[PDB]
Amino acid sequence: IIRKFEGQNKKFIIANARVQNCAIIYCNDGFCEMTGFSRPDVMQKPCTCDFLHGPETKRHDIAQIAQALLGSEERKVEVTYYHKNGSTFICNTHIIPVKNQEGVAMMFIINFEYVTD
Amino acid sequence: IIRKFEGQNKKFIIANARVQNCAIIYCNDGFCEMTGFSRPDVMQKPCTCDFLHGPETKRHDIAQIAQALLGSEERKVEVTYYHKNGSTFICNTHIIPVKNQEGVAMMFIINFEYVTD
């Protein structure tokens, strides 16, 4: 799926699911271009991407994203996020756990799909 | 393929193909267990994994691995590597570039397959 995502100029990050802050260890050019955050501004931040949250970002939506991460579940959540420039965009945030054979999530791939209003 | 690899307890790393030293940004438990190198000893090292090289590691084999990385090519190379404890193992090193739509490698996934002698 990292090949699918990178190959189609998807907008995604990869995070380390083993460390307590779910540190982003990779973000692709498409995620920086869409959100207006520079790669040095995204790297090592929590995988929840709280730097995308603003006033109109709904608490219920933030909680469903955080819950999927905590439960190591695949989930798709529609949410309002904010470009660096303070403009709103609707996003479908697709959390994909990457699990060992024992079923333990080692990484998350999170894909961000822009949704026109 | 990161899902395939992690899900089957393959032994692999992911590297950032954008930075000059091809920095390892992820290594799985199976790669640490097989090679005897701790995760803190592998992280951020070059993706060539020179810490696996010893006397019986052939220069021609090291060069074919490095060439595939430099040319952003998928390649499989059989090579002699060294466990931390100084014992030899034969490895099939499988370099997989992860390219953007424009064809530019952004990451490498490198899988290490033990080969019995």
A11 to chain B: closest CA residue: B100
Question: Residue A93 forms beta bridges with which residues?
Answer: A77, A112
Question: Residue A79 forms beta bridges with which residues?
Answer: A91
Return d(Cα A24, Cα A26) in angstroms, integer.
6
Q: What is the CATH number of domain A2-115?
A: 3.30.450.20
Residue type, A13: I
Give the best residue of A100, A104, A109 to mutate against chain B (max B CB count within 10 A): A100
Q: Do B25 and A25 touch (CB under 8 A)?
A: yes
Which residue in B11, B77, B16 sits closest to B47, CA to CA? B16
Which residue in B12, B95, B1, B96 sits closest to A1, CA to CA? B1
Return d(Cα A24, Cα B94) in angstroms, integer.
25
Return d(Cα A102, Cα B3) in angstroms, integer.
13
Pair of tokens at residue B62? 């090291």
In CATH terms, the superfamily for domain B2-111 is PAS domain (3.30.450.20)
Give B55→chain A minimum CA distance, Å.
34
Residue type, A98: V
The single-letter DSSP state of residue A104 is -
Contact A12, A33 (CB under 8 A): no
What SS3 state is found at B22? coil
Contact B12, B27 (CB under 8 A): yes
Contact A30, A2 (CB under 8 A): no
Distance, CA of A103 to chain centre: 21
B15 to chain A: closest CA residue: A26
Which residue in B54, B100, B47 sits closest to B75, CA to CA? B47
Give the alpha-carbon dihedral of A9, A10, A13, A18, to 10 degrees. Answer: -120
Vertex A48 angle, CA A70 and A7, to 5°: 105
Q: List residues of chain A with CB under 8 Å from any CB of chain B.
A: 1-3, 6-9, 14, 16, 25-26, 28-29, 96, 98-101, 106-107, 109
What contacts A87, CB < 8 A, 6 or more positions away? none
Experimental technique, in short, is: X-ray
Q: What is the resolution of this structure in A?
A: 1.4
What SS3 state is found at B33? helix
